[PDB]
Write a protein that binds this ligand. Sequence first.
Ligand code: JXI
Ligand code: MG
Ligand code: ZN
Length: 313
Amino acid sequence: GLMQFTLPVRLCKEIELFHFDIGPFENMWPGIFVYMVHRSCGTSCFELEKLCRFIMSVKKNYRRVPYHNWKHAVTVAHCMYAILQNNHTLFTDLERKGLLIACLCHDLDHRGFSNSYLQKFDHPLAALYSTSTMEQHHFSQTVSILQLEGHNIFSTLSSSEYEQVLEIIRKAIIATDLALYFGNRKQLEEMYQTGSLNLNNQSHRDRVIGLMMTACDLCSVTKLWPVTKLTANDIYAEFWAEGDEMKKLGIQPIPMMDRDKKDEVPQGQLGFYNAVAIPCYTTLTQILPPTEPLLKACRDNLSQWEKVIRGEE
Ligand SMILES: Cn1cc(-c2ccccc2)nc1/C=C/c1nc2c(cnn2C)c(=O)[nH]1
Ligand SMILES: [Mg+2]
Ligand SMILES: [Zn+2]
């Protein structure tokens, strides 16, 4: 186990900063993810032979959709990595493992369509799992992959270590359901401001890890303007597709998903940052101050949307 990964000096340096873009080179991403595993957890956390086969089974099962794809998976994994490196005493050796594996599997086998659209299309998955449909699907594929002859990266763990980490990953993936985020933050809000929040409380840790997971998923809004602007495209490319399929079911889609209502995007982005991203990072920073760069960035991008509305870009 004396193999390290190293990265070109520029990547080596930039990868530690929250706003790091993993670049257009698909071939390097798995290096970048192992790289984060080693520096974030240690060199013998996982057997390499096995991690390299688990990372590639994962890639294979993420489809070619505009946003909900392999680059997403990895972008989200780096952001949890960033979070963990800047808070390196608040997380256990099990939670540092699981959470990065969670982030890479958090959207396995996404089709590009929302839990809304499965249920109205009457997809089979919406029969097998009433709520958090996709997310429960994604956790299912994570464990599918894990039981493939050769792929069990957690092999070496004790019974309770292993049983615990699958329960960290399960709650982590399910907390990426943006439905479930609104309630979860407002609780962490009360708890923090009444000062009853306790990190030795397992039920509280969970809520917090959930907030981390939502902060990592939305991390497109914490990048430098041009990354965030170009990611927005890939996002609306999926929304409008799902909109086209709603129309085909005889259903008029919410303006967000209607491609005939492009013009009204600058406005709808505003609502989101105000209604979701700014609250999200605001709380996360009040709980974990070394994650301020995410809130500072997010506010910068809000400001840049403000400027798109005023015909200034
Ligand atoms: C709430 N919302 C409303 C609209 C919207 C409404 C009318 C016309 C055009 C757009 N656009 C959004 C934002 C969408 C969104 N942006 C996101 C997400 C992740 N990254 N970003 C920027 C996400 O999950 N949702
Ligand atoms: Mg998801
Ligand atoms: Zn995601």
